């Protein structure tokens, strides 16, 4: 029956077979690895069949929120009200510690392009706008070159793959804002405005880019759809736990011997993932201080939790953190944990779009308090003050960037309050 331990994924089950760019990344290389194979038959089965496969696979968003992808793509499976329907692929990839989306674009720019056609067909869209980080200039070019080849081969454009379905794939480059990864702020950027997220309940599936139905999906979420439709949703569901099905890309960075990007089965133990693929922690699994398991947005967890925690949404939620983008950041015992988290709050203070009050003023307020905790120029009573300020940002903002700046502070105060208080005693006795 079901499994208990997860990991040790065979290469024949991996989806991104050119993750390290050691084969041809152009059309001929992609086709030899299975890309664009029998894509016409996928299209002719209609949106219902494609949406069914994603539902069965239990796939969940890979951008950081983890909503059920198959259920999220069914909002666009409605009749036409006279407006065009678009698909926006989120390639902003701005979360600190996250590098997975860079490799998919630069080394497999035909699973992404094929994903747009299959994902677009499910939603009934006419075209796909791929929003790629503005600093990824070289990656955007390879994406354009692959898109050009797809057009020349008849794989996209008019009568895509001989299916009678017209689909155009456009690439639009950002201009250097982390907030443009947010789905609505991404849409506002495509429309020529500032990267300021919109409010809901006007949802992108009802009023989106150019005021039209749209779906915003991560590159990894879109770059695995064609494989699921071919190998089946049953095959994809065979990995990871229940409700955490699938293979996941991981970025293991920080204080590890061999920082790298690898693909691994969901629910893989955190200790195994670092040891097996990343060469372990610098100084062995005893110099470990804390880990940020899902990019800067997620709270850190200390060594005690890291012993047995599994890398999936449900397991990390129970550990008072999240999976996020599966961007594992490892910090050893030589790290200034207060200073490491202070730089993350400075990052969010430089990336706040500045629209809504709690994160315009609150994040800039958390940054200044953190800048004093690092030096210890604060009282212990300000730790609880910092906690309360954090809870006033979380849930009161337009977008989740405010939430993503509260959680790192809360993680620091949850597990490392003794460190913060000791830092303040040292300053107090020195600066009498």
């Amino acid at each position: 029956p079901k499994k208990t331990s997860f990991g040790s994924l065979k290469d024949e089950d991996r989806i991104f077979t050119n993750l390290y760019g050691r084969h041809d990344w152009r059309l001929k290389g992609a086709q030899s690895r299975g890309d664009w194979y029998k894509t016409k038959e996928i299209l002719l089965k209609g949106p219902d069949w494609i949406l069914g496969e994603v539902k069965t696979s239990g796939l969940r968003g890979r951008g950081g929120a983890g909503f059920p992808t198959g259920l999220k793509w069914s909002f666009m499976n409605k009749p036409s009200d006279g407006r065009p329907k678009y698909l926006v692929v989120n390639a902003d990839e701005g979360e600190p510690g996250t590098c997975k989306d860079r490799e998919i674009i630069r080394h497999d720019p035909h699973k992404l392009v094929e994903g747009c056609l299959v994902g677009g067909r499910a939603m009934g869209a006419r075209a796909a706008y791929i929003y790629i980080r503005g600093e990824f200039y070289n990656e955007a070019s390879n994406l354009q070159v692959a898109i050009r080849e797809a057009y020349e081969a008849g794989l996209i454009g008019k009568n895509a793959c001989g299916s009678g379905y017209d689909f155009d794939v456009f690439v639009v480059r950002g201009a250097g804002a982390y907030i443009c990864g947010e789905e609505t702020a991404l849409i506002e950027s495509i429309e020529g405005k500032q990267g300021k997220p919109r409010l809901k309940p006007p949802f992108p599936a009802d009023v989106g880019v150019f005021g039209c139905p749209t779906t915003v999906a991560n590159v990894e979420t879109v770059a695995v759809s064609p494989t699921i439709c071919r190998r089946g949703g049953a095959w994809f569901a065979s990995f990871g736990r229940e409700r955490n099905s699938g293979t996941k890309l991981f970025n293991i960075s920080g204080h590890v011997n061999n920082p790298c990007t690898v693909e691994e089965e969901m629910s893989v133990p955190l200790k195994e993932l670092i040891e097996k693929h990343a060469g372990g922690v610098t100084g062995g699994w005893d110099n470990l201080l804390a880990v940020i398991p899902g990019g800067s947005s997620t709270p850190l967890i200390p060594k005690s939790v890291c012993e047995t925690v599994l890398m999936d949404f449900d397991a990390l939620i129970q550990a008072q953190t999240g999976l996020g983008t599966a961007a594992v950041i490892v910090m050893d015992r030589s790290t200034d944990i207060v200073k490491a988290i202070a730089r993350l709050i400075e990052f969010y203070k430089h990336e706040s779009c500045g629209q809504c009050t709690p994160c315009r003023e609150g994040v800039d307020w958390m940054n200044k308090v953190m800048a004093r905790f690092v030096r210890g120029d604060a009282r212990p009573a300000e730790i609880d003050s910092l906690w309360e300020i954090s809870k006033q940002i979380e849930g009161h903002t337009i977008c989740a960037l405010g939430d993503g700046a509260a959680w790192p502070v809360q993680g620091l105060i949850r597990h490392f309050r003794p460190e913060l208080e000791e830092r303040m005693q040292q300053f107090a006795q020195q600066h009498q």
Binding site: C353, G354, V363, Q392
Partner: protein
């Protein structure tokens, strides 16, 4: 027929579909706090002062932007709602300058009043405050942008009512600044109205500067004769002297706007 029943504090009210939570609360005499929502401007949803709790939901919703759904119970005075208004007001006043004695808005300032009614009573902000450089936009509107709370009312008014796309937001995060970027004069026949919609003393009247306080003026409700529209005005007098001219709402003539000549 098409009305949907919603509850405000448990009291039932029948509203049209598309009515916002803020508008539903108006039908029972409850005014939700606000700094960015104006009934004659487009919805912005960026001051968060209108956050209100919906029973059986964990996240507070923006009252000015959220449409009501059938059966909702809006808790306009719950603990969760009251703690939201205190958190937002705390953020609004963190970098706000201590200009109240020298600020023309004092005594008729929404930030002051809503801070008394919905905010806390003391500060726990121990850092240094932000300070922005002023921006000359003409001889009528005085600009002191350290008092701005980034509500964008002036931006939306200038674009939707006046038809002049000269005010915007330059910057990002805590350094975001409202203004014209270039040295430009916001000269229009409706320009004086940004003084009234600006909830704070960031935009004030230059002819009226320092002359009076709101509480000592007598409000005489009169008519305007500068043109043939007949805008309804309020004439503020102080000890037998006219101090300023304010708009008076008339839905069929001028709403709450007056021309610069009338002002």
């Amino acid at each position: 027929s098409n009305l949907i029943e919603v509850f405000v504090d448990g009291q039932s009210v029948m509203v049209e579909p598309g009515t916002t939570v803020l508008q539903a609360c108006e039908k029972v005499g409850m005014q939700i706090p606000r700094f960015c929502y104006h009934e004659r401007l487009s919805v912005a949803g960026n001051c968060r002062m209108c956050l209100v709790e919906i029973e059986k939901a964990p996240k507070v919703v923006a009252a000015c932007a959220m449409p009501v759904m059938k059966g909702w119970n809006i808790l306009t005075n719950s603990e969760k709602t009251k703690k939201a208004r205190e958190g937002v007001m705390e953020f609004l006043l963190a970098n706000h300058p201590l200009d109240c004695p020298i600020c023309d808005q004092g005594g008729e300032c929404d930030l002051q009043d809503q801070s008394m009614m919905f905010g806390s009573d003391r500060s726990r902000f121990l850092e240094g405050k932000r300070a922005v450089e002023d921006k000359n936009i003409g001889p009528l509107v005085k600009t002191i942008m350290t008092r701005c709370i980034q509500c964008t009312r002036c931006i939306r008014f200038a674009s939707e009512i006046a038809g002049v796309d000269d005010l915007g937001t330059t910057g990002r995060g805590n350094d975001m600044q409202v203004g014209t970027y270039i040295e430009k004069m916001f000269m229009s026949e409706l320009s004086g109205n940004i003084i009234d919609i600006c909830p704070v003393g960031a935009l004030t009247s230059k002819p009226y500067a320092f002359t009076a306080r709101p509480w000592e003026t007598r409000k005489t409700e009169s008519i305007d004769v500068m043109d043939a529209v007949g805008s309804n005005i309020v004439v503020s007098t102080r000890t037998g002297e006219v101090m300023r001219i304010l708009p008076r709402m008339h839905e069929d003539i001028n709403e709450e706007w007056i021309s610069d000549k009338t002002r």
